[PDB]
Amino acid sequence: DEDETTALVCDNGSGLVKAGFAGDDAPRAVFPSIVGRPRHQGVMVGMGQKDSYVGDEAQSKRGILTLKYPIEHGIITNWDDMEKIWHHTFYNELRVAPEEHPTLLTEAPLNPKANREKMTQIMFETFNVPAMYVAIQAVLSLYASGRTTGIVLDSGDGVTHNVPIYEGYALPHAIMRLDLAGRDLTDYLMKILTERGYSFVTTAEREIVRDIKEKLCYVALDFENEMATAASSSSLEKSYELPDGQVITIGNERFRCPETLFQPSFIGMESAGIHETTYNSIMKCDIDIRKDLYANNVMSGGTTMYPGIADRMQKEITALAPSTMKIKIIAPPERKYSVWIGGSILASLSTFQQMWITKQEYDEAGPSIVHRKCF
Amino acid sequence: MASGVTVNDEVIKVFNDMKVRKSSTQEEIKKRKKAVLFCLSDDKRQIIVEEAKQILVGDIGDTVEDPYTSFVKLLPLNDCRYALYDATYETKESKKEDLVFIFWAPESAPLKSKMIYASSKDAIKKKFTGIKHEWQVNGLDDIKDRSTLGEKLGGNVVVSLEGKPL
Amino acid sequence: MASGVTVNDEVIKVFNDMKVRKSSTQEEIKKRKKAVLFCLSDDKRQIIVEEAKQILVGDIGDTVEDPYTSFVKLLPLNDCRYALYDATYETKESKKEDLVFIFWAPESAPLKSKMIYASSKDAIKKKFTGIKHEWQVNGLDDIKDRSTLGEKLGGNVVVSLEGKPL
């Protein structure tokens, strides 16, 4: 018999979860990787059939929960609530039984050896998944760009990752991270909307500040030019509107917000910008391959959705790099999801014949199977 | 003595079958309920399910525009009820298939259907899990098309609801 | 099953005509393969040969201005492929006659072709051992120019290539 065999896809890199089915180019669910549970009694009096509230349920239930993200930076810092994110993803967001359906998962860049093995473990011992693979996240968007060798940037939520890759292997002497991204840019956005007297604090306003971050914020090509061009216009200040009909105004905050990713000195870290971190990462790669990393800078992740960011990156890196060499940046249309999209395409491939990460083989090879079911 | 009412898991047996996905090439099409109604008993100690029409995902071929725009043409204008809807909205960013809980309590429905369904409303809301959204709806004009249903899910992701572009 | 496509030894038949020579007086002029194309079989499991102009060292006299230039009038504008080349190039201190592996993946081509093809790079690159250069080909307008068939080898040739000045 024949059925559209619904193999499962889940991805997390920097605290934003994406999920759907093998062959979907558009997710069935996307949520922030937060779990909350009661500080005393449940959300309505007595116990429910659950009293743990993930993502959207954690975000919309103020006054009642103690909360964690199992990924407080770029590394997974808890597994026992990360279990409950996957459980909610499968059985509540996607609404499938993973018991009989194969899974593609992604390892988040710059994480210790055991992180993919503890992922492999929980999938075979707790969820009972029949066959699975843990990919490195970055290579799926490298392959979707049309590279097998190059350098990948994530800038998802809670970190920017910078991952040089040669022929599917990420270079462990030269991989880099910058612990500022789309998360803390939401909080910096309300730290400057404070200058207009908007006393924002709640999750119900973090909704609106997210919506300004997606629909209104852009990177400057020249920060002095974009300030002068705004001041020489008869409109720079513009209203956004809250779903209940109330109105809020935003101006130059739209590019003052993004700019601190090109220099963390503005939000007050010592850390260098994403272009500087990219070229420092390239500079720490081997001399016989640095040449091709210049042309193959793949921009993935949620924070790459600001206009001007790839265009600025090419203009910035050409001041850092010896100008005999030539720079090329690539930022896909679906750059927001690109790593999970390449995961969905990998999930749909049935050619298991040189993999063998399965719930038979697991019980001989153990948690470390993932390092002995690859070349 | 203020006893209240209780949900028997016959309401949850149909919820489980409705909620969870199965085989895509047939059993998503005609072994998923897309709409159901839940009702107070004549006794009034319990919530039940009855003949109050369930419809599936494939029945758009056999009969209707879509199952839920058929369901709103079958809602009782003079009684309060609970309903359940698996709301499909589609875009390039996400293909969201969310299960929604509905409290139906018409302006024309009587005060002593109202107060009973309203006080037991959030007992059933804790028995269901893998609901994403909820509606408190109070007449036909609050529910009369998909575009008025999409507003109460909200965001900007509902570019289409139930196969109809908004 | 979450697992990339597997290449088998059908491709090693076509690469026999590359991996070894014969005598230059006749046999190389009928049996050195200069260009050949490979594709994903749409059962979605393996990379096979695409039997659409296997180019050699006779055909260069009859019509084929450069071997690859006749092959660039087949290659799909918006879809991915794999190819091989036996590159004939004169340097300052050696005549080289060296095998090259080509990844064809146009910049505008579908992600859903790109990912399956690109993840097979490892699998084909293990089997086609005895290659000395790798051409990343990002579309037509990254290889229609005759010089970059030398640059993608490392450029350091600087005398002649394919019978043309370099």
Beta carbons of B24 and A27 less than 8 Å apart: no
Q: Which residue of A has its CA nearest to B97?
A: A28
* 3-state SS, residue C85: strand
Strand C47-55 to A16-21 pairing: unpaired
Long-range pairs for C67-72 at CB < 8 Å and ≥24 separation?
C67/C34, C67/C35, C67/C162, C68/C34, C68/C35, C68/C143, C68/C149, C68/C162, C69/C146, C70/C35, C71/C35, C71/C37, C72/C140, C72/C143, C72/C144
Q: Which residue of A has its CA nearest to B153?
A: A243
Q: Which residue of A has its CA nearest to C121?
A: A148
List B100's β-bridge partners, or say none: B85, B133
Instruction: Give me the residue from C1, C112, C138 closest to A345, CB to CB.
Output: C112
Q: How many CB atoms lie within 10 A of CB A96?
A: 19
Half-sphere exposure of residue B166: CA atoms within 13 angstroms, side-chain side: 20
Q: Note whether C138 and C22 are within 8 A (CB).
A: no
Within an 8 Å CB–CB cutoff, is residue A4 touching chain B?
yes
Q: Copy the structure tokens of residue A289.
A: 């391959």
Instruction: Give me the residue from A148, A332, A345 closest to C116, CB to CB.
Output: A345
Within an 8 Å CB–CB cutoff, is residue A319 touching chain B?
no
From the CA atom positions of chain A, what is the Rg in Å? 22
Give the separation between CA A58 and CA A51, rounded to whole angstroms.
11
Give the separation between CA A165 and CA C14, rounded to whole angstroms.
30
Chain C hits for A330, Cβ within 8 Å: 107
Q: C115: phi > 0 → left, psi -120 to 50 → alpha, else beta; which?
A: alpha
* 3-state SS, residue C128: coil
Instruction: Give me the residue from C3, C106, C125 closest to A349, CB to CB.
Output: C3
Chain B hits for A8, Cβ within 8 Å: none
Give the separation between CA A44 and CA B128, rounded to whole angstroms.
13
Q: Note whether B123 and B154 are within 8 A (CB).
A: no
Q: Which residue of A has its CA nearest to B128?
A: A49
Within an 8 Å CB–CB cutoff, is residue A30 touching chain B?
yes
Instruction: Give me the residue from A4, A48, A92 closest to B25, CB to CB.
Output: A4
Beta carbons of A26 and B24 less than 8 Å apart: no
Chain A hits for C111, Cβ within 8 Å: 25, 144, 332, 334, 338, 341-342, 345
Give the separation between CA A188 and CA B155, rounded to whole angstroms.
23
Give the separation between CA A210 and CA A190, rounded to whole angstroms.
10
Beta carbons of A3 and B24 less than 8 Å apart: yes
Within an 8 Å CB–CB cutoff, is residue C112 touching chain A?
yes
Within an 8 Å CB–CB cutoff, is residue C73 touching chain A?
no
Inspect the structure and tell me whether chains A and B have 3 or more CB pairs less than 8 Å apart: yes
Q: Which residue of B has its CA nearest to A214?
A: B156
If we measure between CA atoms, which residue out of C142, C57, C154, C145 comes closest to residue C104?
Answer: C142
The Cα angle at residue A326 between residues A324 and A331, in degrees rounded to 5: 165
**Cα→Cα distances A187→A77, A156, A183, Å:** 22, 15, 7
Give the separation between CA B87 and CA B66, rounded to whole angstroms.
11
Give the separation between CA C114 and CA C109, rounded to whole angstroms.
7
CA distance A101 to chain C (A): 9
Q: Note whether C36 and C67 are within 8 A (CB).
A: no
Strand A247-250 to A176-178 pairing: unpaired
Instruction: State the CATH number of the domain containing residue A223.
Output: 3.90.640.10
Experimental technique used?
NMR
CA distance A234 to chain C (A): 39
Give the separation between CA A95 and CA B28, rounded to whole angstroms.
12
Chain C hits for A22, Cβ within 8 Å: 2
From the CA atom positions of chain C, what is the Rg in Å? 16
Residue B62: is it exposed, middle or buried by C-beta count within 10 angstroms (0-12/13-18/19+)? exposed
Instruction: Give me the residue from A332, A342, A346 closest to C2, CB to CB.
Output: A346
If we measure between CA atoms, which residue out of A10, A57, A1, A7 comes closest to residue A34?
Answer: A57
Within an 8 Å CB–CB cutoff, is residue A91 touching chain B?
yes
Interface size, chain A vs chain B, as Cβ–Cβ contacts under 8 Å: 59
Within an 8 Å CB–CB cutoff, is residue A2 touching chain B?
yes
SS3 readout for chain B: CCCCCEECCHHHHHHHHHHCCCCCCCHHHHCCEEEEEEEECCCCCEEECCCCCCEECCHHHHCCCCHHHHHCCCCCCCCCEEEEEEEEEECCCCEEEEEEEEEECCCCCCHHHHHHHHHCHHHHHHHCCCCCEEEEECCHHHCCCHHHHHCCCCCCCCCEECCEEC
Residue B61: is it exposed, middle or buried by C-beta count within 10 angstroms (0-12/13-18/19+)? exposed
CA distance A7 to chain C (A): 7
If we measure between CA atoms, which residue out of A355, A366, A323, A320 comes closest to residue A117?
Answer: A366
Identity of residue A282:
I
Q: Note whether A261 and A180 are within 8 A (CB).
A: yes
Q: Note whether C80 and C106 are within 8 A (CB).
A: yes
Q: Copy the structure tokens of residue C104.
A: 């064809």
Chain B hits for A215, Cβ within 8 Å: 156
List A329's β-bridge partners, or say none: A297
| Structural domain that includes position A222 | 183-261
SS3 readout for chain A: CCCCCCCEEEEECCCEEEEEECCCCCCCEEEECCEEEECCCCCCCCCCCCCCEECHHHHCCCCCEEEECCCCCCCCCCCCCHHHHHHHHHHHHHCCCHHHCCEEEEECCCCCCHHHHHHHHHHHHCCCCCEEEEEEHHHHHHHHHCCCCEEEEEECCCCEEEEEEECCEECCCCCEEECCCCCHHHHHHHHHHHHHCCCCCCHHHHHHHHHHHHHCCCCCCCHHHHHHHHHCCCCCCEEEECCCCCEEEECCHHHHHHHCCCCCCCCCCCCCCHHHHHHHHHHCCCCCCHHHHCCCEEECCHHHHCCCHHHHHHHHHHHHCCCCCCCCEECCCCCCCHHHHHHHHHHCCECCCCCCCECCCHHHHCHHHHHCCCC
Chain B hits for A89, Cβ within 8 Å: none
Half-sphere exposure of residue C56: CA atoms within 13 angstroms, side-chain side: 15
Phi, psi of A243 (to 5 degrees): -45, -25
Identity of residue B146:
R
Instruction: Give me the residue from A144, A149, A352 closest to C114, CB to CB.
Output: A144
Identity of residue B143:
I
Within an 8 Å CB–CB cutoff, is residue A352 touching chain C?
yes
Within an 8 Å CB–CB cutoff, is residue A345 touching chain C?
yes
* 3-state SS, residue C115: helix
Q: B154: phi > 0 → left, psi -120 to 50 → alpha, else beta; which?
A: left
Chain B hits for A44, Cβ within 8 Å: 122, 125-126
Those chains having 3 or more beta-carbon pairs within 8 angstroms of chain A are: B, C
Strand A297-299 to A329-330 pairing: parallel
From the CA atom positions of chain B, what is the Rg in Å? 16
* 3-state SS, residue C44: coil
Q: Note whether A120 and A370 are within 8 A (CB).
A: yes
Within an 8 Å CB–CB cutoff, is residue A102 touching chain C?
yes
Long-range pairs for A46-54 at CB < 8 Å and ≥24 separation?
A46/B126, A48/B126, A48/B127, A48/B129, A49/B126, A49/B127, A49/B128, A49/B129, A50/B129, A52/A84, A54/A84, A54/A85, A54/A88, A54/A92
Beta carbons of A2 and B99 less than 8 Å apart: no
Q: Note whether B106 and B78 are within 8 A (CB).
A: yes
Q: C163: phi > 0 → left, psi -120 to 50 → alpha, else beta; which?
A: left
CA distance A88 to chain C (A): 21
Q: Which residue of C has its CA nearest to A330?
A: C107
